[PDB]
Amino acid sequence: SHMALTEQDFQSAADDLGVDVASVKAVTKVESRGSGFLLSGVPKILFERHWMFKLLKRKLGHDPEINDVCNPKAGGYLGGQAEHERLDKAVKMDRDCALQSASWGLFQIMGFHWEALGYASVQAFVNAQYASEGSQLNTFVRFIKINPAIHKALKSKNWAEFAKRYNGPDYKKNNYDVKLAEAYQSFK
């Protein structure tokens, strides 16, 4: 109920980035999934078995065993609470790699970014996904900071450049450059 973002959270992030409050609301409206939590109260995730293969391959120094939650071929997605059963299975192979191989919260940030984002450990990154949407928004803010090119675009309010660098070269297919601008106006 209170787990959802508030003006207090939007402003903390805006101040932390050093940008307009409406700019943070804009990207949150488009780049987020509305809620960063499922019904049970656990974070919204999507498990990437090909990242589980890559990360566990780096750790061991050889190919791991290929199953339905560890495979160099991307896909096999279930969805919602079902994704947490895939994570639980992957945790029994290797906890750190599994947790790192899922995208977490509002902005679906991959858990292997934990170190670049400046968290004490993998477990610190996860606890921040369980805490609140405000913490999940802090994670997003941290991702924007470590991408100066994307951070500058947000401050200069380019949208076209921000959408290109964040969403990908094929951003105009979903009208991200436009949606961001129209969203920005809806709050401004």
Author numbering: -1 to 186
What does the literature reporting this entry say, word for word?
The structure of the monomodular Pseudomonas aeruginosa bacteriophage JG004 lysin Pae87 is presented and investigated in relation to repurposing its function as an antimicrobial agent. The structure of Pae87 shows that it is a one-domain protein with the typical α/β lysozyme fold.
The protein without and with PAO1 peptidoglycan was crystallized as described in Section 2. The best apoprotein crystal diffracted only to limited resolution and with somewhat streaky spots, but the best peptidoglycan-bound protein crystal diffracted X-rays to high resolution with cleaner spots. The apo structure could only be refined to relatively high, but not unreasonable, R-factor values, while the peptidoglycan-bound Pae87 structure could be refined to more satisfactory values. The apo Pae87 and Pae87–peptidoglycan models have two and one molecules in the asymmetric unit, respectively. Molecule B of the apo structure is less well ordered than molecule A, as shown by the average temperature factors (68 versus 52 Å2, respectively). There is one amino acid with disallowed Ramachandran values in the apo structure: Gly32 in chain B. This residue has reasonable density and is near Leu76-Gly77 of chain A. Presumably, this contact pushes Gly32 into a somewhat unnatural conformation. The root-mean-square deviations (r.m.s.d.s) between molecules A and B of the apo Pae87 structure and between molecules A or B of the apo structure and molecule A of the Pae87–peptidoglycan structure are 0.5 Å when Cα atoms are superposed. Buffer molecules have also been found in the catalytic clefts of other enzymes, such as the lytic CHAPK domain of the endolysin LysK from Staphylococcus bacteriophage K or chitinase C (ChiC) from Streptomyces griseus HUT6037. They may mimic the enzymatic substrate or product, and thus their position reinforces the idea that Glu29 and Glu46 possess catalytic activity in Pae87.
